[PDB]
Amino acid sequence: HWGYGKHNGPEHWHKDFPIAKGERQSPVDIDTHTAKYDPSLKPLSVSYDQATSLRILNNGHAFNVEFDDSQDKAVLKGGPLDGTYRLIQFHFHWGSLDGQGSEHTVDKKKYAAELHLVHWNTKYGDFGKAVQQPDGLAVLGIFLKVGSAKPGLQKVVDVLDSIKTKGKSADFTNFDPRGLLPESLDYWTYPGSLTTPPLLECVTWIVLKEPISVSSEQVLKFRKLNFNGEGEPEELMVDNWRPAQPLKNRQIKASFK
Ligand SMILES: COCCNC(=O)c1ccc(S(N)(=O)=O)cc1
Ligand SMILES: COCCNC(=O)c1ccc(S(N)(=O)=O)cc1
Ligand SMILES: [Zn+2]
């Protein structure tokens, strides 16, 4: 099936997911000079105070922290969005070395990793119906650079030993995703897609300008995870990022002057 290796990686995905060559694919390079400030964007509202994390899962492509999305407990609104988008999960993409790992790039610069907080538009009732809609999803993307440790990430790092291999899950309640955000909510936004198969073109991307810093030890712990299941030959979970895709007929808007 699909992956990140030579024989099943991004350059192969189009054969089973032809939208891989579509008109609004993600990620993209964010050329900061050609992005345009958009005074029509409303203030962005990240409302995570009632977030209810449930579980962490190694799905063979990344690890997901899942949330209870049966009510409006952790939502994203404002910015480019109409209405309310409910948080369902977050995960990361990262590299084998600190000089790569992000999916979006900024003036071609790659960060060590990228966090994706995935939300679905509540007008569609649940995630599965939302991914049938051109405005079904909003993903908040946050770059990670290696420097000082991020205290609010440590609880994630500490549980990874229990989900080393594909299909493993563990209880992960009472985790506050607000500890993963940078100080500033300045962002760029554009219409795009899921960055993994099935590559559906449902996402309003909101990519924060300010990276968070994580320590070398924190990202090394990400790199000890496995793509494979237990008892299978070990392939380290590293470089699980899709490269930047053609911008095509899209303009990136900035929330800041
Ligand atoms: C199952 O053993 C390996 C044989 N399969 C493959 O090599 C393969 C490669 C690419 C795709 S993809 N990226 O178009 O979906 C799907 C399958
Ligand atoms: C209908 O898809 C089946 C499951 N896939 C997902 O939920 C999914 C969510 C977010 C991203 S990402 N990397 O764009 O944030 C990629 C995939
Ligand atoms: Zn992602």
Side-chain angles (χ1 to χ4, degrees):
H1 212 337
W2 69 269
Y4 293 94
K6 168 175 318 138
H7 297 275
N8 64 0
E11 306 313 312
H12 290 275
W13 294 347
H14 73 100
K15 285 175 282 169
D16 288 86
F17 307 94
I19 202 174
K21 291 182 191 275
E23 286 317 293
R24 56 174 282 193
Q25 287 290 293
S26 293
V28 299
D29 179 55
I30 300 169
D31 171 336
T32 63
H33 293 111
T34 64
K36 198 184 174 181
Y37 170 65
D38 187 348
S40 94
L41 295 165
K42 302 302 172 183
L44 189 65
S45 178
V46 185
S47 306
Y48 288 171
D49 55 283
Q50 306 273 100
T52 295
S53 67
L54 297 178
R55 198 176 65 143
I56 190 166
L57 166 74
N58 176 335
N59 61 27
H61 310 290
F63 62 86
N64 290 358
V65 173
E66 309 153 354
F67 289 78
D68 172 14
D69 68 346
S70 67
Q71 312 183 249
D72 276 341
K73 281 198 190 163
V75 297
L76 183 66
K77 329 177 317 281
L81 304 173
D82 282 347
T84 300
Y85 287 69
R86 196 170 293 175
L87 177 65
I88 179 163
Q89 51 109 329
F90 70 81
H91 60 274
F92 305 79
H93 306 262
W94 60 92
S96 58
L97 305 162
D98 299 347
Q100 65 198 43
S102 67
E103 298 211 298
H104 293 88
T105 54
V106 180
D107 299 326
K108 299 292 179 89
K109 165 192 184 73
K110 298 175 167 75
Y111 286 89
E114 187 173 329
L115 165 61
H116 290 162
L117 293 128
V118 184
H119 313 74
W120 54 272
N121 190 329
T122 60
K123 85 185 225 168
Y124 302 121
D126 70 5
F127 179 85
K129 192 221 278 154
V131 304
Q132 289 159 216
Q133 319 299 331
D135 62 347
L137 300 179
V139 183
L140 179 61
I142 301 178
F143 295 119
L144 280 62
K145 64 181 191 172
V146 171
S148 164
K150 191 67 166 178
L153 180 60
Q154 192 57 36
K155 288 142 298 323
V156 171
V157 162
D158 283 342
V159 86
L160 295 181
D161 270 330
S162 81
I163 58 155
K164 181 190 178 144
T165 51
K166 175 182 38 150
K168 303 198 74 93
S169 71
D171 183 286
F172 205 66
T173 51
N174 306 109
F175 179 75
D176 181 357
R178 292 177 307 181
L180 298 173
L181 310 177
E183 292 183 347
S184 181
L185 292 179
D186 289 344
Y187 64 85
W188 295 284
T189 184
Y190 75 96
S193 74
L194 302 182
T195 68
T196 60
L199 299 168
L200 303 174
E201 288 181 341
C202 315
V203 179
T204 299
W205 276 95
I206 299 172
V207 178
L208 296 191
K209 160 196 71 34
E210 182 168 19
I212 60 167
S213 288
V214 303
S215 70
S216 196
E217 297 96 320
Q218 290 178 321
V219 68
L220 282 153
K221 286 152 172 215
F222 284 16
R223 299 181 182 131
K224 297 183 174 104
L225 291 165
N226 286 184
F227 283 127
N228 52 284
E230 184 173 8
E232 294 178 3
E234 177 170 32
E235 316 239 45
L236 295 187
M237 197 183 270
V238 295
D239 293 316
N240 57 351
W241 49 276
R242 189 192 194 190
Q245 299 304 302
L247 192 59
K248 294 183 160 168
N249 180 35
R250 299 175 289 176
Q251 279 180 156
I252 299 181
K253 297 309 206 186
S255 75
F256 56 101
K257 275 201 201 65

PDB file of all heavy atoms in Angstrom, residues 1-4 8 13 17 61 194-200 242:
ATOM      1  N   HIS A   1       0.871  -1.169   0.000  1.00  0.00           N
ATOM      2  CA  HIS A   1       0.000   0.000   0.000  1.00  0.00           C
ATOM      3  C   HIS A   1       0.921   1.236   0.000  1.00  0.00           C
ATOM      4  O   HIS A   1       2.129   1.102  -0.188  1.00  0.00           O
ATOM      5  CB  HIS A   1      -0.904  -0.044   1.231  1.00  0.00           C
ATOM      6  CG  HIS A   1      -2.258   0.561   1.016  1.00  0.00           C
ATOM      7  ND1 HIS A   1      -2.518   1.497   0.036  1.00  0.00           N
ATOM      8  CD2 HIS A   1      -3.437   0.338   1.643  1.00  0.00           C
ATOM      9  CE1 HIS A   1      -3.796   1.835   0.083  1.00  0.00           C
ATOM     10  NE2 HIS A   1      -4.376   1.144   1.046  1.00  0.00           N
ATOM     11  N   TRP A   2       0.377   2.431   0.204  1.00  0.00           N
ATOM     12  CA  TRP A   2       1.176   3.639   0.060  1.00  0.00           C
ATOM     13  C   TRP A   2       2.053   3.877   1.289  1.00  0.00           C
ATOM     14  O   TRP A   2       1.750   3.438   2.401  1.00  0.00           O
ATOM     15  CB  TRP A   2       0.275   4.851  -0.185  1.00  0.00           C
ATOM     16  CG  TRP A   2      -0.573   5.249   1.000  1.00  0.00           C
ATOM     17  CD1 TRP A   2      -1.842   4.822   1.283  1.00  0.00           C
ATOM     18  CD2 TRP A   2      -0.219   6.172   2.043  1.00  0.00           C
ATOM     19  NE1 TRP A   2      -2.292   5.414   2.436  1.00  0.00           N
ATOM     20  CE2 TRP A   2      -1.314   6.240   2.930  1.00  0.00           C
ATOM     21  CE3 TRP A   2       0.919   6.938   2.319  1.00  0.00           C
ATOM     22  CZ2 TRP A   2      -1.306   7.049   4.070  1.00  0.00           C
ATOM     23  CZ3 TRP A   2       0.924   7.737   3.454  1.00  0.00           C
ATOM     24  CH2 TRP A   2      -0.186   7.786   4.310  1.00  0.00           C
ATOM     25  N   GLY A   3       3.140   4.604   1.080  1.00  0.00           N
ATOM     26  CA  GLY A   3       4.030   4.954   2.169  1.00  0.00           C
ATOM     27  C   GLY A   3       4.936   6.109   1.811  1.00  0.00           C
ATOM     28  O   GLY A   3       4.557   7.015   1.064  1.00  0.00           O
ATOM     29  N   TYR A   4       6.159   6.065   2.349  1.00  0.00           N
ATOM     30  CA  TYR A   4       7.145   7.111   2.101  1.00  0.00           C
ATOM     31  C   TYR A   4       8.455   6.567   1.551  1.00  0.00           C
ATOM     32  O   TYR A   4       9.432   7.316   1.453  1.00  0.00           O
ATOM     33  CB  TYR A   4       7.392   7.928   3.369  1.00  0.00           C
ATOM     34  CG  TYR A   4       6.191   8.733   3.778  1.00  0.00           C
ATOM     35  CD1 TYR A   4       5.287   8.239   4.698  1.00  0.00           C
ATOM     36  CD2 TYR A   4       5.951   9.986   3.230  1.00  0.00           C
ATOM     37  CE1 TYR A   4       4.172   8.967   5.073  1.00  0.00           C
ATOM     38  CE2 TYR A   4       4.831  10.731   3.606  1.00  0.00           C
ATOM     39  CZ  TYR A   4       3.948  10.221   4.527  1.00  0.00           C
ATOM     40  OH  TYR A   4       2.839  10.911   4.921  1.00  0.00           O
ATOM     41  N   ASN A   8       6.879   3.109  -2.767  1.00  0.00           N
ATOM     42  CA  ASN A   8       5.480   3.393  -2.474  1.00  0.00           C
ATOM     43  C   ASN A   8       5.284   4.833  -2.015  1.00  0.00           C
ATOM     44  O   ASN A   8       4.224   5.157  -1.461  1.00  0.00           O
ATOM     45  CB  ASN A   8       4.932   2.428  -1.414  1.00  0.00           C
ATOM     46  CG  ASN A   8       5.631   2.582  -0.080  1.00  0.00           C
ATOM     47  OD1 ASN A   8       6.532   3.406   0.068  1.00  0.00           O
ATOM     48  ND2 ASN A   8       5.203   1.805   0.908  1.00  0.00           N
ATOM     49  N   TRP A  13       1.998   7.938  -5.550  1.00  0.00           N
ATOM     50  CA  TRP A  13       0.639   7.981  -5.011  1.00  0.00           C
ATOM     51  C   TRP A  13      -0.415   8.211  -6.087  1.00  0.00           C
ATOM     52  O   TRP A  13      -1.550   7.722  -5.967  1.00  0.00           O
ATOM     53  CB  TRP A  13       0.519   9.043  -3.931  1.00  0.00           C
ATOM     54  CG  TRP A  13       1.327   8.782  -2.691  1.00  0.00           C
ATOM     55  CD1 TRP A  13       1.951   7.615  -2.334  1.00  0.00           C
ATOM     56  CD2 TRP A  13       1.572   9.709  -1.640  1.00  0.00           C
ATOM     57  NE1 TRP A  13       2.571   7.770  -1.112  1.00  0.00           N
ATOM     58  CE2 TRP A  13       2.345   9.048  -0.668  1.00  0.00           C
ATOM     59  CE3 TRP A  13       1.202  11.036  -1.422  1.00  0.00           C
ATOM     60  CZ2 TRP A  13       2.758   9.679   0.506  1.00  0.00           C
ATOM     61  CZ3 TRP A  13       1.606  11.664  -0.244  1.00  0.00           C
ATOM     62  CH2 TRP A  13       2.381  10.994   0.692  1.00  0.00           C
ATOM     63  N   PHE A  17      -4.344   7.250  -6.395  1.00  0.00           N
ATOM     64  CA  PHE A  17      -5.058   8.443  -5.936  1.00  0.00           C
ATOM     65  C   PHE A  17      -4.805   9.538  -6.964  1.00  0.00           C
ATOM     66  O   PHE A  17      -3.967  10.423  -6.751  1.00  0.00           O
ATOM     67  CB  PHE A  17      -4.622   8.832  -4.513  1.00  0.00           C
ATOM     68  CG  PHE A  17      -4.720   7.692  -3.537  1.00  0.00           C
ATOM     69  CD1 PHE A  17      -3.630   6.885  -3.273  1.00  0.00           C
ATOM     70  CD2 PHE A  17      -5.926   7.396  -2.911  1.00  0.00           C
ATOM     71  CE1 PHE A  17      -3.727   5.801  -2.397  1.00  0.00           C
ATOM     72  CE2 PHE A  17      -6.033   6.317  -2.037  1.00  0.00           C
ATOM     73  CZ  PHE A  17      -4.929   5.518  -1.781  1.00  0.00           C
ATOM     74  N   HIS A  61       1.843   5.497   9.560  1.00  0.00           N
ATOM     75  CA  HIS A  61       2.294   6.660   8.797  1.00  0.00           C
ATOM     76  C   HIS A  61       2.674   7.846   9.665  1.00  0.00           C
ATOM     77  O   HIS A  61       3.472   8.687   9.221  1.00  0.00           O
ATOM     78  CB  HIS A  61       1.208   7.119   7.811  1.00  0.00           C
ATOM     79  CG  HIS A  61       0.647   6.011   6.973  1.00  0.00           C
ATOM     80  ND1 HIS A  61       1.374   5.392   5.978  1.00  0.00           N
ATOM     81  CD2 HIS A  61      -0.572   5.426   6.970  1.00  0.00           C
ATOM     82  CE1 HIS A  61       0.629   4.463   5.406  1.00  0.00           C
ATOM     83  NE2 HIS A  61      -0.556   4.460   5.991  1.00  0.00           N
ATOM     84  N   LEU A 194      -5.673  17.123   1.878  1.00  0.00           N
ATOM     85  CA  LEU A 194      -4.910  16.215   2.731  1.00  0.00           C
ATOM     86  C   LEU A 194      -3.538  15.999   2.099  1.00  0.00           C
ATOM     87  O   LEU A 194      -3.411  15.916   0.877  1.00  0.00           O
ATOM     88  CB  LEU A 194      -5.634  14.873   2.820  1.00  0.00           C
ATOM     89  CG  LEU A 194      -7.064  14.863   3.358  1.00  0.00           C
ATOM     90  CD1 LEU A 194      -7.612  13.432   3.412  1.00  0.00           C
ATOM     91  CD2 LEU A 194      -7.160  15.530   4.721  1.00  0.00           C
ATOM     92  N   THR A 195      -2.502  15.860   2.916  1.00  0.00           N
ATOM     93  CA  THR A 195      -1.157  15.620   2.392  1.00  0.00           C
ATOM     94  C   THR A 195      -0.791  14.143   2.344  1.00  0.00           C
ATOM     95  O   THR A 195       0.341  13.816   1.973  1.00  0.00           O
ATOM     96  CB  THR A 195      -0.094  16.342   3.220  1.00  0.00           C
ATOM     97  OG1 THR A 195      -0.052  15.728   4.508  1.00  0.00           O
ATOM     98  CG2 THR A 195      -0.423  17.825   3.366  1.00  0.00           C
ATOM     99  N   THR A 196      -1.695  13.252   2.722  1.00  0.00           N
ATOM    100  CA  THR A 196      -1.509  11.822   2.568  1.00  0.00           C
ATOM    101  C   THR A 196      -2.690  11.275   1.784  1.00  0.00           C
ATOM    102  O   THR A 196      -3.793  11.855   1.823  1.00  0.00           O
ATOM    103  CB  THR A 196      -1.478  11.086   3.915  1.00  0.00           C
ATOM    104  OG1 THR A 196      -2.725  11.303   4.590  1.00  0.00           O
ATOM    105  CG2 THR A 196      -0.349  11.581   4.769  1.00  0.00           C
ATOM    106  N   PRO A 197      -2.516  10.158   1.085  1.00  0.00           N
ATOM    107  CA  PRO A 197      -3.674   9.469   0.512  1.00  0.00           C
ATOM    108  C   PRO A 197      -4.791   9.395   1.539  1.00  0.00           C
ATOM    109  O   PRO A 197      -4.535   9.091   2.716  1.00  0.00           O
ATOM    110  CB  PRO A 197      -3.102   8.086   0.195  1.00  0.00           C
ATOM    111  CG  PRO A 197      -1.673   8.409  -0.226  1.00  0.00           C
ATOM    112  CD  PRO A 197      -1.246   9.440   0.835  1.00  0.00           C
ATOM    113  N   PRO A 198      -6.042   9.657   1.148  1.00  0.00           N
ATOM    114  CA  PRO A 198      -6.516   9.809  -0.238  1.00  0.00           C
ATOM    115  C   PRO A 198      -6.400  11.222  -0.852  1.00  0.00           C
ATOM    116  O   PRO A 198      -6.968  11.428  -1.923  1.00  0.00           O
ATOM    117  CB  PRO A 198      -7.981   9.379  -0.142  1.00  0.00           C
ATOM    118  CG  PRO A 198      -8.382   9.785   1.263  1.00  0.00           C
ATOM    119  CD  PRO A 198      -7.161   9.556   2.111  1.00  0.00           C
ATOM    120  N   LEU A 199      -5.685  12.151  -0.206  1.00  0.00           N
ATOM    121  CA  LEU A 199      -5.301  13.416  -0.847  1.00  0.00           C
ATOM    122  C   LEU A 199      -6.507  14.284  -1.209  1.00  0.00           C
ATOM    123  O   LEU A 199      -6.447  15.125  -2.122  1.00  0.00           O
ATOM    124  CB  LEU A 199      -4.403  13.175  -2.069  1.00  0.00           C
ATOM    125  CG  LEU A 199      -3.081  12.457  -1.751  1.00  0.00           C
ATOM    126  CD1 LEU A 199      -2.389  11.988  -3.030  1.00  0.00           C
ATOM    127  CD2 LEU A 199      -2.134  13.350  -0.951  1.00  0.00           C
ATOM    128  N   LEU A 200      -7.591  14.141  -0.453  1.00  0.00           N
ATOM    129  CA  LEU A 200      -8.846  14.808  -0.771  1.00  0.00           C
ATOM    130  C   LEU A 200      -8.730  16.321  -0.635  1.00  0.00           C
ATOM    131  O   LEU A 200      -8.120  16.842   0.303  1.00  0.00           O
ATOM    132  CB  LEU A 200      -9.962  14.281   0.138  1.00  0.00           C
ATOM    133  CG  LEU A 200     -10.147  12.777   0.033  1.00  0.00           C
ATOM    134  CD1 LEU A 200     -11.168  12.329   1.058  1.00  0.00           C
ATOM    135  CD2 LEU A 200     -10.584  12.352  -1.369  1.00  0.00           C
ATOM    136  N   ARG A 242       5.313  14.755   2.695  1.00  0.00           N
ATOM    137  CA  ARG A 242       5.153  14.935   1.262  1.00  0.00           C
ATOM    138  C   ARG A 242       5.820  16.243   0.851  1.00  0.00           C
ATOM    139  O   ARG A 242       5.690  17.250   1.554  1.00  0.00           O
ATOM    140  CB  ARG A 242       3.674  14.986   0.902  1.00  0.00           C
ATOM    141  CG  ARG A 242       3.377  14.965  -0.598  1.00  0.00           C
ATOM    142  CD  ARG A 242       1.934  15.314  -0.906  1.00  0.00           C
ATOM    143  NE  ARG A 242       1.637  14.956  -2.284  1.00  0.00           N
ATOM    144  CZ  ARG A 242       0.530  15.285  -2.934  1.00  0.00           C
ATOM    145  NH1 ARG A 242      -0.394  16.068  -2.392  1.00  0.00           N
ATOM    146  NH2 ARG A 242       0.335  14.799  -4.159  1.00  0.00           N
TER     147      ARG A 242
END
